[PDB]
Structure formats: C-alpha cells, structure tokens
Amino acid sequence: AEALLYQILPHSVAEQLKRGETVQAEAFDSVTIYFSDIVGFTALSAESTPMQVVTLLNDLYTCFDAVIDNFDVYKVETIGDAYMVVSGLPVRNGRLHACEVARMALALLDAVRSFRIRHRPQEQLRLRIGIHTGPVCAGVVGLKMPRYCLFGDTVNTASRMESNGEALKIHLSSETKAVLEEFGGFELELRGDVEMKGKGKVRTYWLLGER
Amino acid sequence: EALLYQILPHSVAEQLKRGETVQAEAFDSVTIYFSDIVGFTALSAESTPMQVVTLLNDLYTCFDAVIDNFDVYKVETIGDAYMVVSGLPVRNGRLHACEVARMALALLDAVRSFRIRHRPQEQLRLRIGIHTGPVCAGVVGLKMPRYCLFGDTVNTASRMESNGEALKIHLSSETKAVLEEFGGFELELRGDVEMKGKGKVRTYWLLGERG
Ligand SMILES: Nc1nc2c(ncn2[C@@H]2O[C@H](COP(=O)(O)CP(=O)(O)OP(=O)(O)O)[C@@H](O)[C@H]2O)c(=O)[nH]1
Ligand SMILES: Nc1nc2c(ncn2[C@@H]2O[C@H](COP(=O)(O)CP(=O)(O)OP(=O)(O)O)[C@@H](O)[C@H]2O)c(=O)[nH]1
Ligand SMILES: [Mg+2]
Ligand SMILES: [Mg+2]
C-alpha cells in the first residue's frame, strides 16, 4: 500500500515518510546535475511504425537503469529520451558527487556503444551529456502522488551545457572541472572556445576518461 | 488498490487490470496543450525553500481540480510546465479541440484569483499554446509503466507556447479551422509570425467563447 505510494521518492525520504516523520524543504550548497539527450531522435522516430519506437524506448530504459543503479546517483525524471540525474542531493556526501557523476557518464558512454536497435542493427545511437555543479534547494511536492523536486539556476545551467554539447561527448562546465582536477585521476581537455548561451566569457571542457 | 496504476489513463489502467495487453496506436488527430509560468525563475530566486514548495503544492492543487472537469488527459508535470492532451486514449471525433479550448479558458479564469501565500498583492502570469495534429502513443516502462507520445505535433504545440504571450492563449492555424467550424469562438489573428521551425506562418489568439 504505502510501498507503492513512495515509489518515486528516494529511499531515504521514503523511509522518513513511512515511519511518520516529516520531511522539510532543504538547501544544499553543492550538488551535481547530469543532463543527457539523444541527438537525432525525432528523425529516427519519424520513420518507424508505432511499435518499433515503443520497443526502442523500452530497451533504452532497461539498458540505462541497469547502469544508473550501479552508483550513488538518484534519477529525478525520465520524459521521452532525456535523462536528469542528480548526486549529492538527498543525503550529503562531501565532494564525491562530482566523482560519482563523472564515472557514471563514462559508464553510460560505454554502455551505449553496445546498445542494439532491433529494427536497424548496423547502426549506433548517439548521445549528448552535460554535467554541472552548484547549490540547489530541494523538497517534496505533491500530495496525491509525491515527487522530489529541485529549484535553482544550476539546473538550467546544466541543461544549457547539455544543449550546447556535442554528440558522444561529455560536456563539463568550469565549476565541476575544478572539483574533478582537485580530486585527480581524470582526463579533461579545454574545449578551446567559449559558449554563447547566456554569456560569452564562460569556458567549458570535454571529459575524455579516467586513469 | 486504486493506486496500482494511478499514472496511466483510466481506459489503459482498466485494460491492464483486466488482463489483456495494449498495443501502440497511430492517431489521426489529437489536440495538445502546453502551458507554463513566465517569470518563475526570478520569483523562486528570492524566496526560501518552504515558500516555493508550498507555492508549487498550491498551484498543483488549483490546476488539478480545473483539469478534472473536462475530458482531457494530463501527460506530464515538471516544475511549472503543464502538458495536457485530448482525443488520445479513446477517440471522440473532433471534440478534442473544443474540450481543450474550454479547459484553456477555464485555466486562464482560475489563475486570476490564485493567491501566492508570501505575496498577496501579486498574481501569476500564464502562457498557453495549443496545437492539433497526428500523434502516436504507447505504454513504455517496466516496473513503472507510463503513457507517452511520439510525433512532431508535440514539438509545434510546445513551440506555440514558447512564442506565446503572458495571459494569452496562442493557437496555430490548424486548430483555428476546427474551432471556427465548431462556431461560437472569438478568434483574432496575431500576424505572420516567424516560427522557430519553418518561419512565416499565421497564428491566432483565443479571446473567449460566446454563450
Ligand atoms: N514531453 C515532451 N516531449 C517533447 C517535447 N518537445 C518534444 N518532445 C518529443 O520528445 C522528443 C524530443 O524532441 P526535441 O524537442 O528534444 C527535438 P530533437 O530530438 O530533434 O532535438 P536533439 O535530439 O537535441 O537534436 C521528440 O519525439 C518530440 O516529439 C516537450 O516539450 N515535451
Ligand atoms: N525538474 C526540472 N526543473 C527544470 C527543468 N528545466 C528547468 N527547470 C526549472 O524551472 C526553471 C524555469 O526555467 P525555464 O527554462 O522554464 C524559463 P522560465 O520558466 O523562467 O520562463 P522564461 O524565462 O520566460 O523563458 C529553471 O530555471 C529550473 O529551476 C527540468 O528539466 N527539470
Ligand atoms: Mg532529441
Ligand atoms: Mg517556467
């Protein structure tokens, strides 16, 4: 009964609500947001019967949920093909959110390379990944069906970083690059250009891998 | 028991509960409605987390009671965005446009008396766009099934809202024809706007129905 009402909230919040306690809206000084989008999906889904695209979405969801569940991240929403995954949000963990998300991005890049579309087998699916780090305020909205929600400008900065990114590449801002470099062991390359979405003096980086 | 399939439409939920299986379908005509709050990023950026969480709860409670009066289906709700379609699960002729237009007018009426708890002397500004066209639908997801839509009319229904105006209902030229063959709706031409997809195209405003 209650186990099917708290199927969207994180496990910590689900246990908090189950035992009767109240969950307050909170502010977090640093969380890491990851935004992913499949490029060229409205053209591949424009030349398929209604069953092929449904099956492709089912297969992609089942493939991604088996990799997202390997880490400490929490998947906020999944509409269409876009994915939004946040780390550090429900229970704080210091500065490990950047490392967990940057490892999950490489894992998801490796998982896509073996994904097979069953109505065009000799073809690979392209992906776009953008990561950002910043403070957000989060809380539970809804009463008929509860849902964890986030507010802050870092969400839209992460979405914009994903939008400006390239296919099959991981696009980091300069706020998360500092954290990753301080942790050490990652490979980051300066993009060599400054984006023109909301500013003109912002430097962005490509993530290439980890040692 | 009731909350087993609370996300899916009543028809699809009953079909799954009975025991049968559902198939992806192609719909010849479906009407989509997209709305959002203009200026919400600058209003949640000067309020404490409890204020904005309670505001979101109030807004959801206000809108979900106006929606239930009409024959429509609420697809998704993220942040302040709202997506509502009609004609989708059970075809009902050309009645989707009329129901969606009536719902849009009722939602515009109901947001004039909405009260923000932490600023009583201010009202929220809505932005609404409506489109009609062929879309496909299917139930995707395992262990968490959900209805979803594929097509290009979703993109244009969203673009109509993105190019719209606050406290005004924007219509394409595809739904104006349906509403003028219905008769009884006051439509005023906006002009040859420059849509982000094609370019020079005629769109309209909706001002009210004469009863
Ligand atoms: N639930 C929603 N689905 C949408 C929306 N806009 C588009 N779509 C649908 O989801 C899919 C994504 O389309 P996008 O708007 O992201 C356009 P496209 O995929 O060409 O962009 P890129 O993949 O970034 O090149 C596509 O099938 C659309 O029909 C929206 O606002 N909400
Ligand atoms: N949970 C989510 N919240 C989002 C998402 N995208 C945006 N947002 C939140 O909603 C806020 C609204 O930003 P939008 O991009 O919708 C722009 P706004 O609504 O302020 O309208 P204009 O400024 O008139 O374009 C945004 O800054 C975030 O706090 C998303 O994918 N998921
Ligand atoms: Mg896409
Ligand atoms: Mg908004």
Residue B204 within a domain: no
Residue A81 within a domain: yes
Which of helix, strand or coil describes residue B89? coil
Residue A66 within a domain: yes
Specify the resolution in Å: 3.2
Residue A186 within a domain: no
Residue type at B95? L
B31 contacts B87 by C-beta, under 8 angstroms:
yes
Q: Which residues line ligand 1 (CB under 6 A)?
A: A 37-42, 45, 79-80; B 76, 83, 150-151, 154-155, 158
CA-based nearest residue to A74, from A89, A58, A56, A95? A89
**CATH code at A142?**
3.30.70.1230
Residue B80 within a domain: yes
A14 contacts A6 by C-beta, under 8 angstroms:
yes
Residue A134 within a domain: yes
- The 8-class DSSP code of residue B70 comes to S
Distance from CA of A91 to the nearest CA of B (A): 17
Distance from CA of B134 to the nearest CA of A (A): 12
Residue A51 within a domain: yes
Distance CA A127, CA A170 (A): 9
Distances (CA, A) of A153 to A197, B44, B46, B165, B202: 14, 10, 12, 23, 34
Segment 19-78 of chain B within 8 Å of chain A by CB: 23-26, 41, 44-45, 49-50, 52-53, 56-57, 60-61, 64, 76, 78
A152 contacts A159 by C-beta, under 8 angstroms:
no
Range of the domain at A73: 25-164
User: What's the domain count of chain A?
Assistant: 1
> A129 phi and psi, to 5 degrees?
-130, 130
CA-based nearest residue to B132, from B170, B162, B163? B170
Residue type at B25? E
Report residues near ion ligand 3: CB below 5 Å: A 41
Rounded CA Rg of chain B: 18
Residue B68 within a domain: yes
The four Cα atoms B50, B54, B56, B58 give a dihedral, to 10 degrees, of: -170
